[PDB]
Amino acid sequence: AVLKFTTEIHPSCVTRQKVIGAGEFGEVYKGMLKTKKEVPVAIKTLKAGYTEKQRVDFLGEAGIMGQFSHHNIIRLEGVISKYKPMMIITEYMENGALDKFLREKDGEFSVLQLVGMLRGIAAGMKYLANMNYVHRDLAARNILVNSNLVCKVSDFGLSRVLEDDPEATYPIRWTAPEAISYRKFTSASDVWSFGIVMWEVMTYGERPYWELSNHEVMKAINDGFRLPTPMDCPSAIYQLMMQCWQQERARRPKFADIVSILDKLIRAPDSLKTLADFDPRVSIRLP
Ligand SMILES: Cc1nc(Nc2ncc(C(=O)Nc3c(C)cccc3Cl)s2)cc(N2CCN(CCO)CC2)n1
């Protein structure tokens, strides 16, 4: 039923040009779509021999995305299902995944730009939550960035989301305690993950909890430790991420609250000049 909302695209309208992602059962390409001149698109394929579950999971991502229409959610152009290999075609995000982007652009943005990226992510997440969609895998690696610096939530589906992410192990350090301990994934566990994303953005893609093992992370969280403030981080931003990490689900902000706060800070940007204290890990003394 959900696929009837998607446009079926003829293969002659699609040219794959360059591989930008890859796995065992398909690749992601940058390419062009010619329905105006040709427009750039991203193209994900599913290779022949796929199972019934793989087909349901693959087209299910497109079916979910076709239900959404929001500035901060990746837009679906259409699908190729009548021909093989099958494909999903979306808008092309020129700057790729947010985690890699920030690590390759360390120090290159203003604090206001970084906070603007978080407001966009939060707006997309508010929309998903209100559409009754729990993401389960919110992380900077699953946000895409375009040439306007707009961040859009990516990576949709059911079981395929955690199955396909190599960070998800039998990822812990993005996941709220109740989701780990008793499998309770909700929009409030997505808020926990969003707090981790805030820390990823403000640190230019530092890995959460550094080299602590998964067990060490869980033990630290259960004992009350939390990630320390990033360098040069507005106090209001650190306070907000901390509240995303409340152990008690009910004490966490909703995405509605997050969007409202971030919007107010951006609209009075001097509010971002007050920085949380950074605890230095190296002492440099000079006479
Ligand atoms: C991984 C990656 N993606 C990029 N853009 C994308 N746009 C949309 C994507 C996407 O996957 N759509 C999608 C599809 C198609 C189906 C189902 C679901 C979805 Cl969400 S991927 C750009 C990019 N690069 C550009 C910048 N380079 C800098 C050098 O380091 C690095 C590589 N790399």
Side-chain angles (χ1 to χ4, degrees):
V2 299
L3 283 183
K4 285 173 167 62
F5 309 112
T6 75
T7 299
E8 178 79 21
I9 297 175
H10 193 89
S12 64
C13 302
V14 178
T15 303
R16 285 170 280 174
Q17 297 175 298
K18 174 172 155 61
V19 174
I20 55 179
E24 187 182 13
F25 309 105
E27 305 82 43
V28 182
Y29 302 84
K30 185 265 173 172
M32 305 296 300
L33 179 67
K34 183 123 188 51
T35 168
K36 180 68 184 284
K37 305 176 180 298
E38 38 171 7
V39 295
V41 289
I43 302 151
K44 183 189 291 188
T45 64
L46 184 64
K47 312 250 276 180
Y50 55 81
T51 67
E52 181 185 2
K53 177 192 167 47
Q54 288 175 312
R55 176 261 294 175
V56 172
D57 292 347
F58 178 82
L59 298 180
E61 179 170 32
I64 288 163
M65 294 174 51
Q67 295 296 81
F68 299 148
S69 185
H70 190 280
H71 180 58
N72 300 102
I73 302 295
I74 293 291
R75 186 178 71 260
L76 176 65
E77 294 287 345
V79 301
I80 300 175
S81 62
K82 289 174 54 182
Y83 303 88
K84 310 302 177 281
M86 297 200 299
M87 304 169 136
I88 301 170
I89 302 160
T90 71
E91 64 181 318
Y92 177 61
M93 303 290 284
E94 299 92 338
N95 289 308
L98 174 64
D99 64 330
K100 187 167 188 291
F101 175 72
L102 287 185
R103 293 165 192 153
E104 297 178 359
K105 309 286 170 174
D106 190 5
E108 295 182 26
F109 305 120
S110 68
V111 170
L112 184 65
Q113 284 173 313
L114 296 173
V115 176
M117 291 157 21
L118 291 173
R119 180 183 55 184
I121 300 160
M125 287 307 306
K126 181 186 180 180
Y127 177 77
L128 292 177
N130 286 334
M131 297 289 289
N132 202 23
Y133 185 82
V134 179
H135 191 284
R136 299 144 281 147
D137 197 19
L138 175 59
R141 70 183 165 275
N142 293 322
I143 302 295
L144 290 166
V145 185
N146 73 13
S147 59
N148 282 334
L149 211 62
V150 178
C151 293
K152 304 189 186 211
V153 183
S154 182
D155 196 10
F156 296 99
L158 305 174
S159 53
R160 68 153 300 275
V161 175
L162 290 179
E163 171 62 32
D164 295 349
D165 193 336
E167 291 281 359
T169 54
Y170 298 102
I172 289 290
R173 71 195 58 215
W174 278 264
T175 300
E178 68 277 5
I180 296 165
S181 63
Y182 62 99
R183 314 168 185 264
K184 188 186 180 53
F185 286 86
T186 67
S187 295
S189 57
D190 285 343
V191 164
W192 180 288
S193 304
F194 181 81
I196 304 296
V197 173
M198 295 179 66
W199 193 90
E200 294 186 275
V201 166
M202 302 311 295
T203 62
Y204 286 92
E206 197 83 359
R207 185 168 177 82
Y209 310 92
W210 298 282
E211 81 280 3
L212 290 191
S213 69
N214 287 335
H215 187 266
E216 286 166 345
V217 173
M218 292 186 282
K219 173 66 168 168
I221 290 296
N222 291 344
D223 289 353
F225 296 95
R226 298 293 187 266
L227 290 165
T229 186
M231 306 177 178
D232 289 19
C233 187
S235 170
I237 296 295
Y238 188 59
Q239 291 174 53
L240 182 58
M241 70 179 79
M242 282 292 296
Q243 294 170 254
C244 293
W245 305 325
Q246 288 271 7
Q247 171 76 30
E248 187 176 347
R249 234 192 319 116
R251 301 196 178 181
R252 296 176 201 152
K254 308 303 182 188
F255 285 111
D257 302 309
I258 293 166
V259 169
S260 178
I261 291 159
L262 295 174
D263 192 55
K264 293 167 151 79
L265 297 166
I266 290 164
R267 291 161 71 176
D270 288 341
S271 64
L272 298 170
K273 298 185 302 137
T274 298
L275 303 179
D277 187 38
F278 175 70
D279 271 291
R281 193 193 337 250
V282 198
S283 156
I284 296 291
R285 321 170 286 283
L286 286 177

